[PDB]
Symmetry: C2
Subunit: 180 residues, 2 copies
């Protein structure tokens, strides 16, 4: 954690084009996992990059784990590669980023009680229920988790610019709410 | 069979439409934290309904702590006495609710990983970053924190009925990912 936000995880969905039969893919893709009773989705996995993919019987695929849009764009292609070879006529289509989670550390203790009262229609602070303050930004639609230590978590960004811009908006507020 | 959300805290803001000499009323009230160099307003209080109250010279006050819309309103009336009997135009008026937070326990661990990766549209989940899963409802505007133990926190409702509404709509989802 440093002052500059760094993305932690990226979730993207790829539409394969065709409906799959999960049993055959779990029975041909050398690296896969299936549990129809517990969850209707073949959980595949790869190393370059380390992303996990959830292939659903509708062609819809959800790839998590990448730290960059290049890696989730890359990884997604390769997963489509893995099923194509098995036999189905899948094709990398409509890659859409679903959510991005990032973090940073302003490096100074913050008065969550003061920020909660001041930015009252945005914040919530119930220490006995959750340690952090939940801040709901309406633009960009980001939900920030702010901890008494200075740690920050920005969840919900549909694209990289929103994580960075959300921090620009909150920083000068936090810096005005540090202790002492 | 009933599982229903309880109200943990209601933050209300009501205005005693009249100017208030904060030094004075802090004096009389005596056990009211009024202090220089910081926050210009008097912090009142009461044993029951156990609520804290930030009174501002702008005639406005923000009462916190009430576990119910009626108790708040009640604590909102108590305060316009301690600062009325002291000859003042403490006119109780425009009472508004700023936020309502609830909590609930479904009593079955949840498979958050499955919820998040199939509901990434709303869910934010990073076990190495923060505890729990963040779910953002669009209708009604509510942010729910869901933990593995099955305890959930509902925040941001401006009205009571939205807590029940939010939980009534997410419960079937949580039952689907109930870890057995």
């Amino acid at each position: 954690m440093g002052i500059v936000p760094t993305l932690q995880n990226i979730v993207a969905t790829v539409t394969l084009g065709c409906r799959l039969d999960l049993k055959t893919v779990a029975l041909h893709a050398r690296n896969a996992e299936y549990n129809p009773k517990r969850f209707a989705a073949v959980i595949m996995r790869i190393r370059e990059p380390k992303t996990t993919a959830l292939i659903f019987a509708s062609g819809k695929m959800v790839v998590t784990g990448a730290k960059s849009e290049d890696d989730s764009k890359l990884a997604s292609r390769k997963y489509a590669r893995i099923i194509q070879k098995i036999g189905f006529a899948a094709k990398f289509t409509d890659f859409k980023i679903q959510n991005i989670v990032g973090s940073c550390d302003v490096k100074f203790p913050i008065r969550l009680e003061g920020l909660a009262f001041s930015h009252g229609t945005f914040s919530s602070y119930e220490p006995e229920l959750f340690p952090g303050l939940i801040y709901r930004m309406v633009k960009p639609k980001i939900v920030l988790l702010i901890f008494v230590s200075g740690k920050i978590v920005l969840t919900g960004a549909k694209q990289r610019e929103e994580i960075y811009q959300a921090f620009e908006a909150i920083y000068p507020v936090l810096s005005e709410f540090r202790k002492m």
